[PDB]
Design a protein around this ligand. Structure first.
Ligand code: JDY
Lengths: 99, 99
């Protein structure tokens, strides 16, 4: 679809067999999700944003469905205040900015 | 223009008579700039992101030129790690997401 920005650009995702809402976030390089149970091995990572940093679990090669489009890539799980779909996944679904 | 997301979506802005680069950030409700000298009255505000919060100065009705498009609105100034153009300004320049 086309999404205007009068409201937060929130879409439905499926990841790890679970349904969630997440923000289409062009200011995010990576995809970060609030605590969610994902299978398999992970690596601890510190990531920075406004306010400081958080510790996340990094999962690689995780399939995700983003508003009905299929992608696979790295998902970071940790105490983010919002689920954010970043550019690592947005590039796979052909998401662009236009003005 | 159309902007793809293989790189950070950084554009040139003019604000307060000064030139800066800033991220087109659909995950930002507000526009937040690193320390920059803006004229006039401001109100202290605490804002939250990944990692916690920051104290910012809120300036209202600030004109900004964003990649050659004119907008006016609230700009928050504080210790953000990145200059971000949020939805309060993006809606004025007709910025949309497409996939
Ligand atoms: C700040 C930008 C620069 C980065 N962030 C993406 C922004 O869109 C976040 C999303 C957000 C929204 C809501 C609450 C939040 F806690 C966070 N918006 C945001 O903080 O908004 C703030 C601010 C703007 O106005 C209002 O609107 C929401 C809230 C409030 C005040 S990020 O989440 O820190 C992030 C994400 C992925 C990522 N991947 C990385 N990979 C390594 C380097 C390679 S680093 C990295 C850093």
């Amino acid at each position: 679809p086309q999404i205007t920005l009068w409201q937060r650009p929130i879409v439905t995702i499926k990841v790890g067999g679970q349904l969630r809402e997440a923000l289409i976030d062009t200011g995010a390089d990576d995809t970060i999700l609030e605590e969610i149970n994902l299978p398999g091995r992970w690596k601890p990572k510190l990531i920075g944003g406004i306010g400081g940093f958080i510790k996340v679990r990094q999962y690689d090669q995780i399939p995700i469905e983003i508003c009905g489009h299929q992608a696979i890539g790295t998902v970071l799980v940790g105490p983010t205040p919002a689920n954010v779909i970043g550019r690592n996944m947005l590039t796979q679904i052909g998401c662009t900015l236009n003005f």
